[PDB]
Amino acid sequence: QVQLVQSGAEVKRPGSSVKVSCKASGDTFINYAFSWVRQAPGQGLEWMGRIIPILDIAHYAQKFQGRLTITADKSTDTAYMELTSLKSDDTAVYFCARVFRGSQYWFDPWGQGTLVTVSSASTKGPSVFPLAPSAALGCLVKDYFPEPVTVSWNSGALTSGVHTFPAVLQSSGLYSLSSVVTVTYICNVNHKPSNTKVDKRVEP
Amino acid sequence: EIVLTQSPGTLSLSPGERATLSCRASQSINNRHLAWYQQKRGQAPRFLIYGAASRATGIPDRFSGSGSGTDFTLTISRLEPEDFAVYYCQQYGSSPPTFGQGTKVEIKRTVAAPSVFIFPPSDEQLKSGTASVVCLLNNFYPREAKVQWKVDNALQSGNSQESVTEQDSKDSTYSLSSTLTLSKADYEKHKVYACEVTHQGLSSPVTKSFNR
Amino acid sequence: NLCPFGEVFNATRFASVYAWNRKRISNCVADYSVLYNSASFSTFKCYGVSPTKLNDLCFTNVYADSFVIRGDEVRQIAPGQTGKIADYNYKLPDDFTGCVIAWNSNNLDSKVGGNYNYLYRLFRKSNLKPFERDISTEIYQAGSTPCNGVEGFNCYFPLQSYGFQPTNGVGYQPYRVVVLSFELLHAPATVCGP
Ligand SMILES: *[C@@H]1O[C@H](CO)[C@@H](O)[C@H](O)[C@H]1NC(C)=O
């Protein structure tokens, strides 16, 4: 019934503002307040603010009083969030919650979260490296900024032992991952944001 | 009131044993104002208990909480294989709501030994300036690893400190990796690059070493 | 010289029922006959004073309470009434002297899709005193179990939106109400009449 549908990811530049939406459905919009909580990679949850649609008043945290501007459109039942002067350590998953209209509350209904990255760089294509081992072999996709990357193996031929290693942000702002599976091994890499369907052949 | 810490942190439990999560208060929350959540990997947190005693709607009877003033505990009896996620604490006794750290309930399986592999560079990797040497471990239960290197003088990390993350699987096993970064011709010019890891019973693993 | 009445009747933005704006107007000449024959109102019930002969009396200090209510709650704005507005939102004394002016404002106070800008207090602990303004927004403790800040059950939010829809009946439309309190005393009067 109650579905707090948010928007998608936002590839944003350092030192700017973002605008995420939270489509509130199900019950009424004025009988329930709305709060936004972020989740940094690996860290805990941080309560940023909370808007009261029936009163049009907001209550921010000590570290957000003067930087966060949260609105609430009582017509389309959508909650918005805007952060001025974004820094590099603001890359987190912002969730939409529907708290009650009280001084104390809990975050019972959640949304889906948005992986809004703030430390961006130039877009590059998957530069797969033909790792020749000393049959355990893999494909190391290197130098790509956009997170969504489908590292398959010959249109998904191998479906046993294909462990997609999670990517780790390097010092150059271009995180990279690998996929080693022990079984022509043409690991097809499909980059969804850009247009680079490289299929590098890797043989030991 | 302002900080919440979990005692277990990473509680490894068998699929069926009872769990006991701890979340001690900081400034003696008066009216037991504490709530528990279940944040699955890649999903939204699920509301479980309000007021530390009363569960929400749809929550099974397996979840139960306690605690009065400064130490609340969550009891999950007969843990099913589905309740394997992070559990956060949230207090609302003061004006600003503060969360905790979260206890990652992981599967408890038999201890297994990993497998060491080395990926030397190639003709397209040597003459590229991005010579990468990858050493990964597969099929090991203890996710805590001390993967080390032997780069030409000592346990030298250098560019091998990537520390690629890992995750569980259907057989309750982990598999991490670690890549390197070298120069145009600094791979074959230097000595042999070895790889070991201080495993629980395999502290000195020597297997598939490639000299230059 | 003329008393300013264009800020209490022709005000572009009015206030809610629980946050009615009281305006003190003194040391002026105020003619009240131009509002009766204007034929632009709906109710002009003068309590205590008469609808006529008010331009021949000098008042000490008059007020102007302005708020927006619905059509089925206009009768509650009168000396000695009951209900919900006269109990928790705006209470008039039994010896109230003055005129209650109200007119339909659905043409401009009815946003398409439900106007949620005007609120009213649903229920409070005790009744409201004559000419008292309670802008508190804490949850109402009902039932037996104290909520202690949370809403939960047995603790409802006191304020409630009207929801003025353009396509409503004759009783569910906005009605801007202006309440004048002709306070008369033996002291030198300031608000005289032509
Ligand atoms: C409001 O404006 C109209 C139009 O100018 C005018 O006739 C009326 O007298 C004004 N109201 C008051 C209280 O003066």
XYZ file of C-alpha atoms and ligand atoms in Angstrom:
624
model
C 0.000 0.000 0.000
C 2.420 2.660 1.251
C 5.183 2.875 -1.373
C 7.721 5.687 -0.925
C 9.203 5.523 -4.413
C 12.344 7.619 -4.860
C 14.276 8.647 -7.973
C 17.382 7.051 -9.487
C 21.074 7.632 -8.953
C 22.525 11.081 -9.654
C 26.059 11.431 -11.038
C 26.768 14.912 -9.662
C 29.851 17.173 -9.849
C 31.734 18.277 -6.716
C 30.516 21.593 -5.355
C 26.895 21.714 -6.514
C 23.349 20.854 -5.420
C 21.085 17.839 -5.902
C 17.310 17.383 -6.090
C 15.912 13.954 -5.188
C 12.201 13.161 -5.034
C 10.168 10.802 -2.847
C 6.806 9.849 -4.373
C 4.558 9.290 -1.354
C 1.566 7.049 -2.048
C -0.986 4.935 -0.193
C -2.475 6.935 2.674
C -2.744 10.719 2.944
C 0.285 13.001 2.727
C -0.580 15.558 5.421
C -1.261 13.046 8.222
C 2.373 11.849 8.223
C 5.681 13.696 8.416
C 8.737 12.791 6.335
C 12.399 12.485 7.316
C 15.531 11.836 5.259
C 18.366 9.622 6.521
C 21.660 8.963 4.732
C 23.856 5.856 4.861
C 27.542 6.280 4.081
C 29.333 3.233 2.595
C 30.002 0.927 5.540
C 29.027 3.578 8.099
C 25.808 3.910 10.088
C 22.665 5.945 9.560
C 22.586 9.727 9.989
C 19.372 11.663 10.637
C 19.573 14.803 8.496
C 16.191 16.476 8.884
C 12.430 16.103 9.045
C 9.601 18.059 7.400
C 6.056 18.460 8.727
C 3.683 18.870 5.748
C 0.717 20.023 7.843
C 2.872 22.720 9.482
C 5.444 23.365 6.702
C 8.218 23.477 9.314
C 11.540 21.639 9.274
C 13.979 20.561 11.990
C 17.594 19.996 10.947
C 20.586 18.556 12.772
C 23.428 20.582 14.272
C 25.688 19.828 11.287
C 22.916 20.515 8.739
C 21.349 23.710 10.156
C 22.104 26.172 7.359
C 23.006 23.729 4.562
C 20.003 21.434 4.036
C 16.755 22.744 2.526
C 13.947 20.158 2.523
C 10.573 20.999 0.972
C 7.256 19.168 0.719
C 4.787 19.568 -2.156
C 1.302 18.937 -0.745
C -0.158 18.618 -4.271
C 1.694 15.702 -5.900
C 2.599 14.083 -2.538
C 6.338 14.350 -3.180
C 9.131 15.172 -0.732
C 12.240 16.939 -2.025
C 15.766 17.384 -0.685
C 18.414 19.957 -1.593
C 21.968 20.275 -0.258
C 23.941 23.458 -0.922
C 27.726 23.367 -1.432
C 28.204 19.608 -1.583
C 31.621 18.325 -0.527
C 33.487 15.154 -1.500
C 32.476 13.119 1.584
C 28.721 13.305 0.882
C 28.543 10.167 -1.297
C 25.885 8.162 0.540
C 22.557 6.392 0.066
C 19.794 8.853 0.969
C 16.645 7.096 2.194
C 13.124 8.515 2.447
C 11.213 7.796 5.659
C 7.648 8.566 6.760
C 7.768 9.472 10.457
C 4.761 10.481 12.554
C 3.789 14.043 13.488
C 5.341 14.096 16.941
C 8.396 15.234 18.849
C 9.583 11.613 19.088
C 9.165 9.128 16.254
C 10.518 6.033 14.531
C 11.299 5.383 10.865
C 8.790 2.619 10.162
C 8.225 3.045 6.379
C 11.365 3.392 4.249
C 11.952 3.912 0.546
C 14.563 2.528 -1.842
C 17.568 4.849 -1.458
C 19.593 6.745 -4.062
C 23.335 6.211 -4.560
C 24.142 9.858 -5.264
C 27.893 10.130 -5.858
C 29.475 13.557 -5.343
C 33.151 12.840 -6.167
C 32.907 12.531 -9.951
C 35.399 12.533 -12.813
C 35.566 11.992 -16.568
C 33.691 9.048 -18.066
C 35.889 6.242 -19.406
C 35.267 2.878 -21.020
C 36.133 -0.565 -19.654
C 39.839 -1.252 -20.256
C 39.969 -4.999 -19.677
C 43.408 -6.474 -18.992
C 44.334 -9.988 -20.248
C 45.598 -11.483 -16.993
C 47.697 -14.524 -17.902
C 48.163 -16.779 -14.840
C 50.972 -19.278 -14.255
C 42.492 -23.169 -15.004
C 42.067 -20.166 -12.697
C 41.766 -17.069 -14.892
C 39.847 -13.811 -14.798
C 39.340 -10.380 -16.366
C 40.348 -7.127 -14.651
C 38.219 -4.195 -15.816
C 40.296 -1.064 -15.201
C 39.816 2.708 -15.492
C 36.041 3.193 -15.506
C 34.159 5.847 -13.543
C 30.473 4.776 -13.926
C 29.576 2.146 -11.309
C 27.120 -0.021 -13.343
C 29.237 -2.549 -15.265
C 28.213 -6.090 -16.252
C 31.342 -8.254 -16.408
C 30.005 -11.420 -18.035
C 31.733 -14.392 -19.698
C 30.725 -15.073 -23.324
C 27.130 -13.844 -22.989
C 26.879 -15.445 -19.557
C 28.275 -18.824 -20.604
C 29.949 -19.614 -17.267
C 27.454 -19.604 -14.382
C 29.523 -21.454 -11.754
C 32.266 -19.726 -9.781
C 31.955 -16.319 -11.485
C 32.499 -14.207 -8.364
C 32.035 -10.520 -9.208
C 34.433 -8.846 -6.788
C 33.152 -5.527 -5.381
C 34.924 -2.448 -6.695
C 37.042 -0.217 -4.451
C 37.531 3.506 -5.057
C 41.124 4.136 -6.130
C 43.099 7.349 -5.658
C 42.343 8.389 -9.261
C 38.586 8.425 -8.633
C 38.100 5.457 -11.002
C 37.221 2.327 -9.043
C 37.911 -1.048 -10.639
C 36.940 -4.662 -9.992
C 37.804 -8.149 -11.224
C 35.974 -11.407 -11.928
C 38.031 -14.605 -11.608
C 36.335 -17.928 -12.387
C 38.130 -21.283 -12.587
C 36.657 -23.737 -15.095
C 37.258 -19.312 -26.032
C 37.015 -17.459 -22.705
C 35.921 -14.104 -24.123
C 34.708 -12.260 -21.023
C 32.131 -9.836 -22.425
C 31.943 -6.559 -20.481
C 28.807 -4.455 -20.997
C 29.044 -0.818 -19.888
C 25.493 0.478 -19.486
C 25.997 4.273 -19.055
C 28.555 4.744 -21.841
C 28.770 2.817 -25.146
C 31.767 0.466 -24.982
C 30.952 -3.237 -25.401
C 34.516 -4.534 -25.208
C 34.944 -8.324 -25.311
C 38.573 -8.984 -24.388
C 39.958 -12.479 -24.974
C 41.902 -13.846 -21.992
C 43.783 -17.148 -22.189
C 46.385 -18.554 -19.739
C 20.934 9.561 23.824
C 23.691 10.570 21.407
C 25.738 7.387 20.745
C 24.795 3.713 20.423
C 27.249 0.813 20.188
C 26.681 -2.868 19.431
C 28.564 -5.453 21.487
C 28.813 -8.411 19.027
C 29.561 -6.430 15.876
C 29.862 -9.555 13.707
C 27.934 -12.347 15.438
C 28.523 -15.691 13.722
C 25.649 -18.027 14.594
C 24.424 -21.410 13.424
C 21.264 -21.613 11.274
C 18.814 -22.354 14.077
C 20.529 -21.191 17.250
C 19.165 -18.258 19.229
C 20.702 -14.798 18.895
C 21.278 -12.075 21.483
C 22.113 -8.588 20.208
C 23.188 -5.874 22.646
C 22.759 -2.100 22.373
C 23.702 -0.178 25.512
C 22.339 3.326 26.019
C 24.468 6.390 26.744
C 22.431 8.828 28.873
C 19.753 6.595 30.448
C 16.881 6.819 27.962
C 13.868 7.326 30.230
C 10.837 5.716 28.562
C 12.666 2.785 26.912
C 12.688 4.760 23.641
C 14.608 2.397 21.374
C 13.776 0.753 18.048
C 15.423 -2.052 16.089
C 15.748 -2.477 12.328
C 16.878 -5.072 9.783
C 18.854 -3.525 6.910
C 19.423 -6.227 4.308
C 22.365 -5.873 1.928
C 21.093 -3.685 -0.902
C 17.635 -3.031 0.572
C 15.811 -0.654 2.930
C 15.759 -1.159 6.714
C 12.805 -3.167 8.017
C 11.079 -1.873 11.144
C 10.931 -4.625 13.772
C 10.223 -3.385 17.326
C 9.039 -0.062 18.760
C 9.564 0.864 22.396
C 12.059 -2.040 22.748
C 9.236 -4.342 23.912
C 6.372 -4.314 21.380
C 6.951 -5.676 17.884
C 5.492 -4.075 14.764
C 2.762 -5.453 12.495
C 3.740 -8.625 10.655
C 6.870 -9.267 12.733
C 7.061 -12.942 13.803
C 7.164 -13.997 17.441
C 10.846 -14.958 17.108
C 11.876 -11.318 17.639
C 11.728 -9.966 21.190
C 13.385 -7.131 23.077
C 14.148 -6.209 26.670
C 16.011 -3.603 28.701
C 14.725 -0.796 30.921
C 17.134 2.104 31.373
C 20.648 1.653 29.991
C 20.984 -1.741 28.254
C 18.486 -3.174 25.761
C 18.841 -6.638 24.232
C 17.238 -8.195 21.153
C 16.365 -11.902 21.298
C 15.977 -13.845 18.042
C 15.137 -17.440 18.946
C 15.332 -20.144 16.257
C 17.228 -18.043 13.728
C 16.106 -18.935 10.211
C 18.558 -18.811 7.275
C 16.634 -15.780 5.957
C 17.389 -13.431 8.886
C 21.009 -12.859 7.833
C 21.477 -9.086 7.627
C 22.560 -6.041 9.650
C 20.490 -4.941 12.653
C 20.616 -1.273 13.658
C 19.494 0.430 16.861
C 17.606 3.727 16.983
C 16.650 5.758 20.056
C 14.037 8.521 20.228
C 14.183 9.578 23.870
C 15.687 12.972 23.041
C 15.116 15.531 20.290
C 17.764 14.367 17.760
C 17.411 10.689 16.813
C 20.717 8.808 16.804
C 21.488 5.394 15.321
C 24.068 2.736 16.130
C 26.655 0.701 14.216
C 24.861 -2.545 13.366
C 25.529 -6.237 14.017
C 26.250 -8.311 10.900
C 24.814 -11.765 11.611
C 26.874 -14.094 9.409
C 26.477 -17.787 8.654
C 28.523 -20.222 10.752
C 30.048 -22.930 8.547
C 32.990 -25.312 8.772
C 36.444 -23.749 8.554
C 38.024 -24.293 5.135
C 41.425 -23.552 3.616
C 41.799 -20.984 0.813
C 43.556 -21.362 -2.550
C 46.445 -19.120 -3.611
C 46.752 -18.035 -7.249
C 49.140 -15.640 -8.990
C 48.388 -13.714 -12.197
C 51.649 -12.463 -13.759
C 51.441 -9.725 -16.413
C 51.602 -10.361 -20.161
C 52.875 -8.772 -23.377
C 49.953 -6.323 -23.333
C 50.440 -5.688 -19.588
C 54.223 -5.271 -19.356
C 54.492 -2.637 -22.106
C 51.546 -0.662 -20.723
C 52.676 0.924 -17.439
C 49.828 -0.786 -15.537
C 51.323 -4.200 -14.783
C 48.940 -5.774 -12.259
C 49.672 -8.890 -10.189
C 46.502 -10.329 -8.643
C 46.523 -12.723 -5.679
C 43.129 -14.007 -4.539
C 41.840 -16.500 -1.974
C 38.749 -18.635 -2.588
C 36.493 -20.909 -0.511
C 37.445 -19.874 3.016
C 35.104 -19.424 5.978
C 37.134 -16.951 8.131
C 36.657 -13.718 6.202
C 39.369 -12.056 8.301
C 42.539 -12.293 6.217
C 46.092 -10.997 6.562
C 47.184 -11.276 2.920
C 50.855 -10.301 2.729
C 53.488 -9.768 0.043
C 57.248 -10.155 -0.409
C 58.138 -7.310 -2.760
C 61.920 -7.516 -3.121
C 62.913 -6.567 0.429
C 60.212 -7.324 3.043
C 56.446 -7.478 3.600
C 56.042 -4.425 1.370
C 52.484 -3.438 0.470
C 53.091 -0.595 -1.984
C 50.384 -0.915 -4.634
C 49.183 -4.314 -3.357
C 47.152 -2.648 -0.569
C 43.998 -2.524 -2.714
C 42.198 -4.974 -0.377
C 39.301 -5.889 -2.644
C 36.195 -6.645 -0.596
C 34.256 -9.919 -0.653
C 30.855 -11.376 0.234
C 29.242 -14.665 1.203
C 27.653 -17.199 -1.146
C 25.307 -20.186 -1.113
C 27.943 -22.453 0.464
C 28.728 -19.820 3.145
C 32.194 -19.092 1.751
C 34.081 -15.881 1.011
C 36.511 -14.993 -1.773
C 38.596 -11.805 -1.732
C 41.392 -10.566 -3.992
C 44.163 -7.980 -4.233
C 45.647 -6.344 -7.331
C 48.979 -4.613 -7.920
C 50.249 -1.661 -9.943
C 53.755 -1.492 -11.396
C 55.894 0.472 -13.859
C 56.902 -0.085 -17.489
C 59.628 -2.646 -16.752
C 59.788 -2.927 -12.947
C 58.186 -6.392 -12.813
C 60.794 -8.577 -14.525
C 63.642 -6.323 -13.361
C 62.875 -6.970 -9.681
C 62.833 -10.280 -7.791
C 59.991 -12.793 -7.458
C 56.707 -11.433 -6.082
C 55.292 -13.937 -3.597
C 51.923 -13.983 -1.843
C 50.864 -15.389 1.528
C 48.034 -14.921 4.023
C 47.863 -15.576 7.776
C 44.929 -17.978 7.639
C 43.463 -19.940 10.555
C 45.719 -22.952 10.073
C 47.380 -21.833 6.813
C 49.497 -18.911 8.008
C 52.296 -19.799 5.545
C 50.628 -20.811 2.259
C 53.127 -21.408 -0.560
C 51.423 -22.473 -3.793
C 51.764 -21.446 -7.455
C 54.660 -19.005 -7.149
C 55.876 -17.414 -10.390
C 59.453 -16.115 -10.552
C 59.489 -12.926 -12.655
C -7.595 60.310 9.283
C -9.873 57.489 8.151
C -9.493 54.224 10.030
C -7.699 51.489 8.047
C -10.201 48.745 7.218
C -8.494 47.544 4.023
C -6.166 45.253 5.991
C -8.860 43.263 7.827
C -11.503 42.846 5.078
C -9.455 43.129 1.864
C -6.440 41.247 3.244
C -4.915 39.037 0.557
C -3.891 36.375 3.103
C -5.919 35.526 6.203
C -4.992 33.291 9.146
C -6.182 29.960 10.506
C -8.812 29.492 13.204
C -6.387 28.710 16.042
C -3.988 31.503 15.015
C -6.445 34.348 14.433
C -4.826 37.772 14.061
C -5.966 40.424 16.544
C -5.565 44.020 15.346
C -5.912 47.025 17.656
C -7.241 50.126 15.877
C -7.675 53.343 17.864
C -7.388 57.123 17.450
C -9.326 57.227 14.190
C -12.711 57.927 12.618
C -14.497 54.709 11.644
C -17.695 54.597 9.588
C -19.487 51.245 9.763
C -22.446 52.010 7.475
C -20.396 51.459 4.294
C -20.144 47.747 5.142
C -23.862 47.100 5.675
C -25.176 48.642 2.446
C -22.238 47.167 0.504
C -24.249 43.924 0.113
C -20.988 41.973 -0.266
C -21.327 39.894 2.930
C -23.512 37.052 4.199
C -23.917 37.635 7.955
C -23.845 40.988 9.760
C -25.123 40.000 13.206
C -24.420 42.888 15.600
C -24.441 41.655 19.203
C -25.100 44.230 21.905
C -24.905 47.166 19.499
C -27.381 47.630 16.666
C -26.556 47.342 12.943
C -27.569 51.016 12.674
C -26.753 54.046 14.855
C -23.135 52.823 15.045
C -21.896 55.867 13.095
C -23.095 58.118 15.950
C -21.104 56.489 18.778
C -17.491 56.981 19.863
C -15.706 53.796 20.932
C -12.730 53.532 23.271
C -10.715 50.810 21.513
C -12.040 48.307 18.980
C -10.391 45.118 17.727
C -10.608 43.052 14.543
C -10.289 39.264 14.807
C -9.948 37.676 11.359
C -9.947 33.963 10.525
C -11.289 31.481 7.973
C -13.783 28.758 8.916
C -16.260 26.557 7.061
C -19.932 27.248 6.413
C -21.258 24.806 9.020
C -19.211 26.469 11.793
C -20.295 30.098 11.343
C -23.105 29.756 13.903
C -20.534 28.881 16.584
C -19.097 32.428 16.372
C -21.637 33.977 18.741
C -21.948 34.804 22.467
C -22.782 31.647 24.386
C -22.351 28.786 21.915
C -20.769 25.333 21.836
C -19.251 22.839 19.422
C -15.643 22.697 18.255
C -14.634 26.219 17.199
C -16.170 27.923 20.242
C -14.564 25.342 22.567
C -10.977 24.905 21.327
C -10.405 27.470 18.539
C -12.116 30.823 19.195
C -14.366 31.563 22.183
C -16.613 34.631 22.520
C -17.749 35.914 25.931
C -21.388 35.875 26.969
C -21.371 39.696 27.224
C -19.736 40.248 23.832
C -20.593 43.611 22.257
C -19.891 44.085 18.567
C -20.734 42.746 15.129
C -19.820 39.407 13.548
C -19.090 39.835 9.830
C -18.664 36.826 7.541
C -18.798 36.253 3.793
C -18.169 33.385 1.396
C -14.600 33.280 0.066
C -14.658 30.062 -1.976
C -13.625 31.948 -5.128
C -10.115 32.601 -3.769
C -9.634 30.395 -0.664
C -10.326 27.068 -2.436
C -7.216 25.711 -4.144
C -7.878 23.203 -6.921
C -7.312 19.755 -5.441
C -7.788 20.618 -1.768
C -6.436 23.682 0.033
C -4.395 22.460 3.017
C -3.236 25.877 4.254
C -6.028 26.491 6.796
C -6.000 24.401 9.979
C -8.217 24.082 13.039
C -7.756 22.558 16.479
C -9.692 19.297 16.705
C -9.650 18.673 20.465
C -7.775 19.936 23.526
C -7.715 19.162 27.247
C -9.794 22.085 28.542
C -12.150 24.548 26.893
C -10.929 27.855 25.507
C -11.390 31.070 27.469
C -12.963 34.162 25.872
C -10.407 35.905 23.639
C -7.646 33.347 24.187
C -5.084 32.173 21.621
C -3.601 28.681 22.043
C -0.992 27.934 19.373
C 0.313 24.771 21.064
C 1.043 21.813 18.785
C 1.896 19.002 21.211
C 0.039 15.703 20.937
C -3.216 15.381 22.873
C -2.954 12.866 25.716
C -6.050 10.660 25.415
C -6.958 7.193 26.628
C -4.954 5.946 29.592
C -1.429 5.091 28.415
C 0.824 8.187 28.255
C 2.577 8.441 24.897
C 5.293 10.855 26.127
C 6.054 12.590 22.825
C 5.211 9.915 20.254
C 1.929 9.875 18.345
C 1.185 6.136 18.368
C -2.290 5.283 19.620
C -4.513 7.250 22.017
C -2.463 10.384 21.198
C -3.686 12.276 18.132
C -2.324 15.413 16.519
C -4.415 18.400 17.679
C -4.400 20.380 14.425
C -6.368 19.178 11.408
C -6.627 20.464 7.847
C -9.948 21.632 6.434
C -9.380 20.481 2.857
C -11.283 23.216 1.021
C -12.166 21.596 -2.317
C -13.610 23.882 -5.025
C -16.366 21.326 -5.745
C -18.024 21.192 -2.322
C -21.469 21.940 -0.942
C -22.789 25.170 0.518
C -21.586 24.140 3.981
C -18.064 23.001 3.080
C -16.844 26.312 1.629
C -14.453 28.855 3.184
C -16.048 31.770 5.042
C -13.768 34.607 6.129
C -14.996 35.946 9.479
C -14.170 39.380 10.912
C -15.095 39.923 14.570
C -15.193 43.515 15.826
C -15.160 44.063 19.603
C -16.711 47.463 20.377
C -15.142 47.910 23.805
C -16.949 50.781 25.546
C -15.790 52.400 28.787
C -16.163 55.704 30.613
C -12.595 56.651 29.659
C -12.003 59.164 26.829
C -13.012 57.373 23.635
C -10.785 57.457 20.550
C -12.698 55.638 17.787
C -15.454 58.145 17.007
C -18.048 58.068 14.244
C -19.021 60.518 11.469
C -12.282 46.492 -0.275
O -12.101 46.924 -1.630
C -13.325 47.260 -2.300
C -12.961 47.598 -3.727
O -12.079 48.710 -3.790
C -14.016 48.410 -1.572
O -15.263 48.681 -2.201
C -14.238 48.049 -0.109
O -14.765 49.169 0.593
C -12.927 47.613 0.539
N -13.150 47.197 1.914
C -13.099 48.040 2.949
C -13.356 47.440 4.299
O -12.857 49.234 2.804
